[model samples]
Target: SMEQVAMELRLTELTRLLRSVLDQLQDKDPARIFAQPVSLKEVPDYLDHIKHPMDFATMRKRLEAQGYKNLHEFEEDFDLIIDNCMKYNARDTVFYRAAVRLRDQGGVVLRQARREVDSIG
Candidate 1:
């Protein structure tokens, strides 16, 4: 049965870790700004300036699809959502600050999970 195995995050493991990191990120987002997509109707300019538009909901959907190949894809998408906020929001506002915290906090979540998979091989 054990035909092949490798040093990598498989689909089930990737899904598990992605969900864990996302859940924590959403919890930290009290204002829920990252919960859904940016309101294009309210501010169409958001997409006009930011090249990549990502949101927590979008990431959730992707996770359900089990579409990512590894930890990098999951965290990179997570990183983009936070990066998007920082790029769009002014530094003095809470929006930017919240994103900064999520960026720092979520990294540890992903990083620690990253190490756990290393020892099994």
Candidate 2:
């Protein structure tokens, strides 16, 4: 359909714009390119870093049960948990606590998590 084609074209254009912007930003601050990325495997360390002191053993088992093979997979499930927390205003819940630990990680993770959460609800 024309509409779908138009939408695809818009998305392609948006991607090109974003890529160009990122390239410019990276060039302006070369250090940004060397920034270390976080993974779900390090969530436990993040939990500890924030002094939440969670039982990682149990958490790892739970994550494994969710069939998370990589950081992206775990992130998807974590997003669901975050959604449930925010929807019910679950400040004291484990999901919210975990989010707080990852707060300093970056807005991208939090934003995507929140977006995914709303979609699930």
Candidate 3:
């Protein structure tokens, strides 16, 4: 389903666009960029803007399907996931760290779509 949707949307094209933008970003390291505090309002666009592209729409759908209809919702849930992941398990902590890195710096094109969603909402 995700592959089907991506193909229909020309998501690969979008990723190309995102990579172009990322090439110009001042802070290219997603881990440091995401951990640095930012406004909730800005988070949505910022996240969307930095995504790789092909993965944006499907990832957003996954977030929405998980009941995160907006940045605020996802932020809270994501924070909880990160927090719980750090509790007592070294493997989980490492996993969460790796996941956060990916989550923060994933597909660029889809992130732009997410930004549009935030703007329109």
Worst 10 residues of 3 by lDDT: 50-59
Using TM-score as the measure, the top candidate is 1
Clashing pairs in 2: none
lDDT of each: 0.80, 0.40, 0.41
- Return the number of clashes found in candidate 3: 12
**Candidates 1 and 3 compared by lDDT, better number:** 1
Every model's TM-score: 0.84, 0.32, 0.30
* Residue 41 shift from truth in candidate 2, angstroms: 7.8
Superposed on all Cα atoms, the candidates' RMSDs to the truth, in angstroms, are 2.8, 13.0, 14.1
Off by over 4 Å in 2: 32-34, 39-44, 47-121
Tens digits of per-residue lDDT for model 2 on 34-81?
123233484445433332222223334544343333334444444433
Name the lDDT value of residue 16 in candidate 3: 42
Better of 2 and 3 by lDDT: 3
Give candidate 1's whole-model lDDT.
0.80
Pairs in clash, predicted candidate 1: none
Q: Comparing 1 and 2 by lDDT, which wins?
A: 1
Flag regions of model 3 displaced more than 4 Å: 1-69, 91-93, 106-114
- Could you tell me how far off, in angstroms, the CA of residue 24 lies in candidate 2 after the best superposition? 1.1
